[PDB]
Symmetry: C2
């Protein structure tokens, strides 16, 4: 009945979140990897921009991870 429905709706919504989050974490991770490669190969300049980009991507990932943790507690 209705309580089973709410719990199920809640589980389904969480499952989708984890899907979307995981897809969205994949993108920063590929960015870090790709940029790191280019830099190692000598194809780029300003290592401070590489590290600033890594800092940015990591901060974004932090917020995604924390969103999941908080969702779990709501």
């Amino acid at each position: 009945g209705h309580m089973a429905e709410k719990a199920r709706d809640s589980e389904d919504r969480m499952r989708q979140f984890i899907t979307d989050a995981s897809h969205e974490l994949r993108t920063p991770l590929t960015t870090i990897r790709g940029f790191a490669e280019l830099y190692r190969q000598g194809a780029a300049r300003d290592v401070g921009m590489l590290l600033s980009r890594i800092e940015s991507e990591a901060s974004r990932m932090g917020l995604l991870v924390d969103d999941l943790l908080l969702l779990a507690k709501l």
Copy 2:
């Protein structure tokens, strides 16, 4: 009733799963972030080593994330 109880149990395991999985991502992330802050503070002598660790943690998270993506389907 029975339906609600099974449904809640399934929902609470999903929440538990989401908490575990997210804490597991958090750990390599705090490394990447910490290492990038070291660099911004002027403290990095061997950036290649710093970058290597960063790459290693990113690849580790990459695998965690790919596995989460598959588990969210089960």
